[PDB]
Structure formats: C-alpha cells, structure tokens
Amino acid sequence: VPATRILLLVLAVIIYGTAGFHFIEGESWTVSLYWTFVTIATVGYGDYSPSTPLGMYFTVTLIVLGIGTFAVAVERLLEFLISRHVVICGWSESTLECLRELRGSEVFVLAEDENVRKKVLRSGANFVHGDPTRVSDLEKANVRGARAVIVDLESDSETIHCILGIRKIDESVRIIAEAERYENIEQLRMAGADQVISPFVISGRLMSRSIDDGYEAMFVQDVLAEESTRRMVEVPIPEGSKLEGVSVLDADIHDVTGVIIIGVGRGDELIIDPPRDYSFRAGDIILGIGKPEEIERLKNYISA
Amino acid sequence: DLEKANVRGARAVIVDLESDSETIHCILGIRKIDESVRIIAEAERYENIEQLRMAGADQVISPFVISGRLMSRSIDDGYEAMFVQDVLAEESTRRMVEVPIPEGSKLEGVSVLDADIHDVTGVIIIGVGRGDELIIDPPRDYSFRAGDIILGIGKPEEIERLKNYISA
Amino acid sequence: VPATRILLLVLAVIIYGTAGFHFIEGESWTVSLYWTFVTIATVGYGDYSPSTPLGMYFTVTLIVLGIGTFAVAVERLLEFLISRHVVICGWSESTLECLRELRGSEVFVLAEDENVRKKVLRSGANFVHGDPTRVSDLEKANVRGARAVIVDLESDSETIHCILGIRKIDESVRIIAEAERYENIEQLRMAGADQVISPFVISGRLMSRSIDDGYEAMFVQDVLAEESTRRMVEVPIPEGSKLEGVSVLDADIHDVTGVIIIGVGRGDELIIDPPRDYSFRAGDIILGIGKPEEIERLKNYISA
Amino acid sequence: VPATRILLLVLAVIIYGTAGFHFIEGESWTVSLYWTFVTIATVGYGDYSPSTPLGMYFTVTLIVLGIGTFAVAVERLLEFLISRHVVICGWSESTLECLRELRGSEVFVLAEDENVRKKVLRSGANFVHGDPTRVSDLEKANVRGARAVIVDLESDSETIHCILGIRKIDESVRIIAEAERYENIEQLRMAGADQVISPFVISGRLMSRSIDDGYEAMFVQDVLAEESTRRMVEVPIPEGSKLEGVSVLDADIHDVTGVIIIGVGRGDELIIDPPRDYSFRAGDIILGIGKPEEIERLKNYISA
Amino acid sequence: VPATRILLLVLAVIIYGTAGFHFIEGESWTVSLYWTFVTIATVGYGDYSPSTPLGMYFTVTLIVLGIGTFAVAVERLLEFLISRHVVICGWSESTLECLRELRGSEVFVLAEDENVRKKVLRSGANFVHGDPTRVSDLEKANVRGARAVIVDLESDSETIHCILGIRKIDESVRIIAEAERYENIEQLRMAGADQVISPFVISGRLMSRSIDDGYEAMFVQDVLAEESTRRMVEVPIPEGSKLEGVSVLDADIHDVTGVIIIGVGRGDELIIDPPRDYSFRAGDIILGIGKPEEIERLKNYISA
C-alpha cells in the first residue's frame, strides 16, 4: 500500500478517535488527541479512559480500527527515516578491466542487466540500474557532476544514442567511447565522444604485425601494463619553465635524463617523433617512456 | 577440418573463435598436426592468457585488456591512446618497424650510448629484441649482438638511413 | 487461515475473557467486555484489573490465549478494509501520450501484458488485467458507464474485434480507434467507431509536404502541444446568444475578438473556411486558434 | 527455533521477572508472577510497578529481555492451537468446453502452465501443477482412482507419451484422447487410448459438406447441444426385458414410442441404421434421438 | 539494517525521550529514563505520564518515533541472544544418475544455471552457483580437498577447459570426464583426465552389436545396475595374503569360491582374461562377478 495512503488512513483514525473521545467523554481536544495516540499505539497509561458505557463501546471500536492502522503506519515511517566521480554506461570486459584500473576513485555503473550487481559491487563500484540510452536514467547516475563518462554498449547505434543523451545533459563532460566496427569511428566522433577507442582495429593490426615476430604486440601490452620497469606517463611543461622556446634538438632530454621522448601533444593533437626544430611551449604535454627514477629526474629538469 | 585448410604447409595460424574454450581446443588441435607452426591467439578474458600460452600459442593478443587500459588512462587526456592507435595504421607519417642486425655489421659489441642512433639517423629506439624477449628502453651499457632486432619509430627516410647505417 | 475462522477464534476469546472477568472479579458484563478488549489488545489502562489471586491467574491465561489471537484478527481485518471514467484498450505510444494529456480523470487501462502494470500505475491510471477482445474482460473494466473508450491494439483486426465487442456491450458509448492501414478506416467506422485516427497517413502526408519547407508539420505539432502561446479551442454557441441568425460576414469575429475562425462544426460534420453567407445557429461549435485573452474575449462576445 | 526451546526461554524470563520483582519490590510471589506477565505482554495495567531505582532499572532489563521472547512464544503457541473423479491432462479449448459440460463432478486438471490456475479454479476444477508425460506427476493427480482420463496436449507425440504413462500406472482406466493430425489416429489407438476424437477431421468434413446447404453441420451442432428439444441419449436394454430375441422389424420402436433409433451398440462396436433382421439382446445399447417425454416412454417400454 | 546501527538509533530515541520528559515534566533523570522505556515498549504503566500540553505533544512524538525503533531493536537483539567430498561440474543426465548412485557422501554441484538449484537439492547435493571454466569459481567449490571431480559440460571444448582449470588448481586430484566425440579422448587424457568415459561410443557399439541378438547390452545394463543378484566387484589383494606368487592356473578361484575372474588390474592397466601363467602379486585388484556370498567367500579366501 502506498505510504501516503497509509498516512491518510492513520490521520482519519486519529480524527475519529479524538472527536469521539471529546464528545463522548468530554475531555479537551488536546487531551482527546493525546488519549487517541496513547490508545492506538497500545501504550494505555490510564490517566484518561472512558467512564461511560458509550465511551467503552467507542473505545473498543477505536482499538479494533486503530491499532492495526497505527502499526502499519509506524512501520512505513521507519522506512523513510531509516576529484569527481566516473560514470560507466554498460558492462563489458573492457569496462571490467577499466574498473580494475580505477581503484580508489568513485565509480558508478549504469547497466540494464540486474544480475551483474554482485560483480559490480565486488569490483568496487556502485551499481545504478537503468537504460543508458534514456535521459532520466542517464541523469540519475550523476552524469552532470562527473569528470568522465565511459560508454561501452552492445552495438554502435546504442553507443551513439548514449553519447547524444549525455550531450543533451552536459555539454562539458568527457565521453570515452568504444567502437565495435571500424567505419563508425567518425560517426562516434560526430555524435560527441571526446575519444573513440577501437579495440578490434588494434587487435587486428597487432595480429597482422605478429606474423613474422611479435615485438610490437609485446611492446604495446607491456608498456600499457603498470607492472613493468618502464612506464608511459605524460609530464606537462609548467608555466615559467626553463624549456620555453628551446627546441628538442637544443634540449637533448634523452641525453640529460634517459627518458624516451616519443611524442609531444598540445590540446587534442599529438605529433609522434617530432622534428628537431620543434619549439617547445608552456602547456605542451610530453609523452615519454622511462623508469620512475628517470621520470622524477625529468620532472626536476623541466621545473620552474 | 583443420587438415583441410593446409595447416602443415602454413607459416602462421591466427586463431580467433567465438569463445576462449574453443580457442584452446583449436590450438590443441593445431598442435596435434604441426608442432612447430606459429600460432597467434586472442584471449577474450584475462585469466586465460597463461592457459592459451601453455596450450601452445606463440603470441597471445588480448584486446579487451588493451581497451580497458586505454580507457582508464584516457580520463585526463588521451595521448597514449592516440599514440597506440596512430602508430599502428599503415597511412601515417611515422611507422613502427623491426630492423634486424646483420652479421658483419658495424655495431658488433657497440653499446647503445656510443652507437648514438637518434642524433645520427633520427629513429626513436624504443626497444632491442632478441629471441622471445623484448627489452623496452635498454640501459646505456647494453652491448649489441649480430642477430638482435631493433624496434624503432621514424620517418621512412630515417628508416632507410638506419638500414644504411647498420649495414655490413 | 481463513478470515472467518480467525473471526470465530477471536470471538471465543472475547466470550472467555468477558465471562471470566464478570464471574471472578464481579464487574458488570459491559465493563468485563471492555476490560477484555483493553487487555487482549495490550492497551491495559488499569482502570479495571483483577484484585483476587484467581483473577490474576485467569488474566495471565487470557493474556497468553488472547493477545496472539487478537493480533492475527486485526491484521486480517486490515486486508478487508484496505466526470465519468475513460477506458483505454491496449498499451502503446499513442495511448501513452493520450494518458499524459488526460491527467485528472479516472483512466482504466485494459491490457494483456502484466509487466506494463508498473508503467501504467506510474503514468496515473488503474490497470485492469485482461484481454480487450473478450467481452467479459471488457465488462470487467467498466465499459458500460464510461464516457469514451480508446482502442489501440496490436493489429487492425484486433481493433475491429474490440470495437465489435464494445458495441455488443454498449450502443451509446464513444469509441475512438487507431487505424494501422488506410484501407481499414471505413471498416472501423462501419464496425462502430465514433472517430478513426490514422497516425501513419498524417505522418506520410506531413513527410511528403515537408520536402520544400516544413511549415505544415510545425503548425500541427505546435497547435496540438499545450505548452505554446496559442491553443486550438472549441467554443460552443449557447442558446439565446447574440449571434443566432447572423452570417459570418456580418458577425466579423476576427477583428473584434482576435481569434482565427478556421472552421465551424455541427453534429458530426465540419466546415473548414466557411463561406460568408453561412448563417450561424444555436448549438454550433466554433473551432478557433488564439491567445487565451482572445479566447475569453470571444467567450464573452458570444454570451446570452 | 524449535518450539520447545522458545518455551524454555520464556519460562526462564518468567522466573527472572518474578523473582526479581519479589525480592526488589517486596510483592508476593503470586503478584510478582502476575506483574511479570502483564509487563512482558506489554499490557502494563500499572496496578503494580516498581517504586525503587533498582526496581526501575530491573524493569527496563525485563522489558528488553522479555517482550521479544514473549512475542515469539505466543506466535509459536498460535501454531499448535491453530462416481469417482475425472482427470484432465493439458489445458486447451476442447478441455475448457469439456469442463463446462462436467459440472457437478470432481475434476482434476494436470497442466504445465502455472498462469492458468485462475481459470481452472473459476471453471470448477482442482488444479494440479505438473508435466503430464512424467509418471510421478501423472500419479499425483490420482490417475489410479479415476474413472476417465482426458488427454489433450500440444502435439501427438506428447499425447502418445501421456497415454503410455497412464497405461503404465493403471491398465483399466478409460483414456479419451484427441488427435491433432489425421494419420496419428491409429497410433493413438495403438498406444492405448480407448477413444480418439479428431476434431479437425469432423470440422473439415462439415466444411466440405456445407458448400451447398449446411444441414449436416446444423444437425451435429444442434443434437450435441443440451439446449434443444431433441436429445441424443443412450438407453440400455436391461437384463430380463420384453425385447430379447425380438428384431427391430418386429419391435417398431419409432411406431410405439416416437424416438428415432439411429444405432445399436454392443461392447465397442456400433452399427448405424441396423437392418430389419437384427436380433436384439440383453446389454445392447440403443442410441436414439427424441424428446425427454419420448425418452421416458422408451424406458417404460423396454422395462423388465 | 546492520544491528549496530539499530542500536545507535534506539539509544538516540532513549536520549531524546529521557531528556524531554526530564525537562518538560520535571521528573528525575532516572524516572525519565524508566518512563521512556515503559513508553516506547508500549507497556505504559501510567505511574508517570505527562501533565502539561507540551508534555502530551512531546509524548505523541516519542510514541511515533520510538515504538517502531524499539520494536526493530528488540527483534535484532533476539537474534544475538538466540570420506572427503566429490565435485560435479555441470548438470546433465549422466551426472544425474551418478548422483543417484552416490548417496551418502558430500556432493557439490557446480553449474551455470540457477534454476537447477531445486533439482540438485532434491537429488541430495549442495549447489554451488558459478562457471566451471573459471578458476575462481572452481576454487569456490572446494576442488582442492576433494577426492574426485566429475566433469560433464555442454561441449567438449568446455570439458577440456574445465580439466585444464582443475589441473591448474590441483595436480593430484582424480578427474573423470565425459567425451562427446571419439576424436577428443586423447585430448582429454593429455589435458589431465584420469578417466574418459564416452557414452556415445558405448551406445553405438551396443546398438551395432544388438542387431542379431542383444545379450551384450543386457549383460552390461544388468551388471551395472545395483538391483540385480550379481554385482561386479573389485576385490583388492592385501599384503601378506596366501596368493602372493601363485599363478591363476594354480590358484583356481572360480571353483573354490564361485566368482568369475574376468580381469585383474595393476596401477592403471587392466588384463582381461589373464593367461594361466600370470603370477599374482600383492596390491593387485581382482575384478569379478558373483553373488555376494561368493564375494565374501573370495574375500575370506584371499585373507592374510
């Protein structure tokens, strides 16, 4: 029974008891209200009680009509009294490994299947039941206050629908989508995903380059793992550093530090193996590979 | 039906079936026939990589692990996913290549510091591989051997300059 | 346990307690009955209580035999205590938007699926499980007293079947149907539908008239939406009005009131763009578009 | 929790409360026992209550330890204080009309679907959930003590499986089966059905004979209905009648009675329109059509 | 709700009631605490009660906030006051009959489906929900300590996968598998199965040897059924027996004991119809058929 209906029913009992006791027994409205609560709660202090036969009959009726109603009301009342996050739309293996790598951050998971709640709660993420393509269920999972939304649904049509729903809610959040087919990459970028990660294209190109000898697949699957001695990290050039205007040919970062500078990125553009006259700026993101000691040495070298 | 498709005369077998149990079964069926052919598998789950390598696959390529690690590392900015997805496409300006070291070359015993590959040629040397191991960012005391594989990134003019520089 | 058996059991406890207290403690039959209720309900005012050892023992027996029996009785009692309507046959998108606009009235949704119960009750309608083609399941949903029945089923044959069933039940109710194909409009009107609405014919004509520029679709979907500034209203001419027997040329509604007279209706006919020699009568319905200030000016204009 | 353990627990609470109140508050053992019941039942008359701080603390402990224990005890106490049939396997329309015609007899229904229990219980038959092809579920529905089993399953393979299961349980019961295809009639007779009723063969032959004028379908669907003036009933010739050895040509039953003798059956063989020298016996079942007055006259004519 | 949270909630109610009654009604802290318990437990002696309008209102609030909280607290308190196994991976017909013969021991059935739980628990085994191919779901079902693991999954690739998983967990346990095709027996034995049973090969050979007369199928299905008179028993030769170093020609088991010596086994090999020069050893297993009196005579024959 809806809680609000139970509320009305108990209020009606309260009115019935209070008016009855007031008129039959002649006590004040306040005393009559108090007596009604004491009676229907089954407290029964006995400071007030009926002294007439009509009052006795009336009290038996209030007992029968009121005690059950009050009991159901209190139990229903019980129920009502008793950086940012990352939202993940859909549940797959890619999102499972992403959730493995995202320990220590607050992760919501928006999925349609109800029987995945055990593995979502075991992996360390809050589960939000719902359809990721619907704007109300997208909204509930706190898409507004997020810092990144990761979309991995069953097909590319549902992924594009989810991306357009998220862009209807928040036009500033970051969307990381996954392409299931190759030709839908530009369409997933047209819908509004900030970056499209196509895993089957990477897998097919590694399986094609691994016929002769598989050094490329070993390199990719080793530097992406946070278990090896060398790690791929992005250091930013701070505002007011010693490197503004200095080219990479004048810098020789691999000579002084020992990290391998494989790319320099600005904004959303990356140039792999930049030429010698590329002039550094403040804000350029250096993508390099080296040991964490070399990483700390590179941070100390490009300091303010 | 495996012996139908000429597994004995092949040089590489690529096994990507519907599930991982089927992949291990097909790898066992291949190793029944030709015990030395090269098998490239694909792991649909992270737990099955050691089983696919025990069953006989020379190279296991797990796409969902790579996708999850590129998803989790692109929350801030996706230069790593851009690097991975742009170095593999056979249309870009820079290419990842494997260059073998011939016998009788100019770099027998020469360390990587005295070889000075990046300033002379322009090829970013990300790893020197040998056999079935790959050493990413090798230290400065690493002495080369005739038979090593140099894995690098560069423009094809720099690749030709590297091949002409290590030539015998 | 059947409710009636629980009733007998609690009555037996009541007789036992009342007779016992009367004979052992010497209180009147009425006081003894009242004391029995107060005791087995666990209210226990203490205005009456046993004063003899036998009465104390008896009271403990009544407590043990009576409190559980009364508790089960009140909970079983709980269960039994705890213009005209519109019936909607079938559940789809058209009936969903119709239910969205029909707030405030009583709506009974008759549907085959049981899983639509939560969305029907969340949209604000009482769900009646059944088959809309059966006559008995139609009579369950109170078709006899309703003021309109809206039929929209899966196919067109099921719609004609439900219309024939409603016409077998009631020969006066208003039936609104939805045609799936253009050929079945005359069959639905012969079978008894008071109005047949064909959404695919309207959609095809709007999609074919929206090639060059789509002002027709904008006009239709703006005057049907009750969020815009202008609304399409039907204003009936009352008996004894000032406009009985005037032509629409001499009446000149648009400049004096501000509304746009797009058509006039009589009975079951409609005259769009009525010519200037059309003499008004009493009881005619004026179909117009205008701002609600102009609608109220037109309503005050046509007064008696 | 075993009922006897709950008994011990409540007795222990009673001892605790009684001894405590007696020693702390100084009331008699009997008053203390009574007070303990009144308190742990939450009646609380207040004729007795603690008047010392120690007694107040003790009473709060008794309330906490005793009220729940007493509640569980009373609820546990509640529990201790408080010709033959026809089995139908499967649910179809044919079994629905058979169950309509079988009012007043005890009917079990063995079906797999759980969501037919409402219509089975509304039609006047007990519902037994189960698979009709399984021998244990066949057995539960009391196939042994039945007088006839009616098998109408989805296909002919399941019908033959059900017939063989029933013949494994009871080799003497009567099985009435329904053929869905024409060629499976002899196989349904081989499995062990006593009579196979093929409705689509009857329907196809009536639809073939109803091209010119449909008098045959009117005759069949009228004499099978128990609503017309003429009824098809089988009268048996009793042991020791006036008709033994008398042929139908010497009898002239239609001349003396007015019933139409369309067939005479013996055992499981029926001869429609028997010839004139057919000698009657004792035990031959006369199949005739007539009004119930003519039926009673025919019963009085062939009497002993 | 965690028990400790309910504890805090009831303590908060107690503080609220005690402080309120003390300040509003002016009773001592101890009396106020006692009154609060008496009230929220619904005992209501009435020795103390509010005498001011504010106290009456406050008491109604305590009744509403406190009675439900106390009720939930007492019920939660109630709760605190009051050889080795065999694992079966997968559920089918073969594992069902294997579970029927394996009564008395502890059996853990590991299966993907959740709807097989009732039939597994009715057959007499503890159901463990999981995936038999996963290593973690294997380790959940206690494969490490078991004495045999029976693998029968949907396909043969899943069976090889589960065998590889069990061999990754434990290198000593006994694995029994079921082959679907004849080609995979060697792959299942290479993957680590201690015994491969192929039901379709046995069935095909029995169906091909049952064309002329089927005494082979009768022999197999009678000596495997534990309801016949003769049973196929394995009788091990103990250390220090009378038959160490005798040939089977000189031992002459069949005439002196009554059993039929069809084969002898050693380690993982079996010699069917062993020749007369075969010298017995200690530890050998004798495979024989006979009545249990003959089996006990053979057991007493081979004693130390």
From Swiss-Prot, chains A, C, D, E:
Membrane topology classification: Multi-pass membrane protein
Localization per Swiss-Prot or TrEMBL: Cell membrane
InterPro entries: K_chnl_dom (IPR013099), NAD(P)-bd_dom_sf (IPR036291), RCK_C (IPR006037), RCK_C_sf (IPR036721), RCK_N (IPR003148), Trk_Ktr_HKT_K-transport (IPR050721)
Taxonomic superkingdom: Archaea
Domain RCK N-terminal: 83-198
Keyword ATP-binding: no
Binding residues for Ca(2+): D152, E178, E180
Gene3D superfamilies to which the protein is assigned, alphabetical: 1.10.287.70, NAD(P)-binding Rossmann-like Domain (3.40.50.720), Regulator of K+ conductance, C-terminal domain (3.30.70.1450), Voltage-gated potassium channel (1.20.5.870)
Molecular functions per Gene Ontology: identical protein binding; metal ion binding; monoatomic cation transmembrane transporter activity
RCK C-terminal domain span: 220-304
Intramembrane stretches: 32-41, 42-47
Subunit structure: Homotetramer.
Miscellaneous field: It is not known whether calcium is the physiological ligand.
UniProt function note: Calcium-gated potassium channel.
Protein name (record): Calcium-gated potassium channel MthK
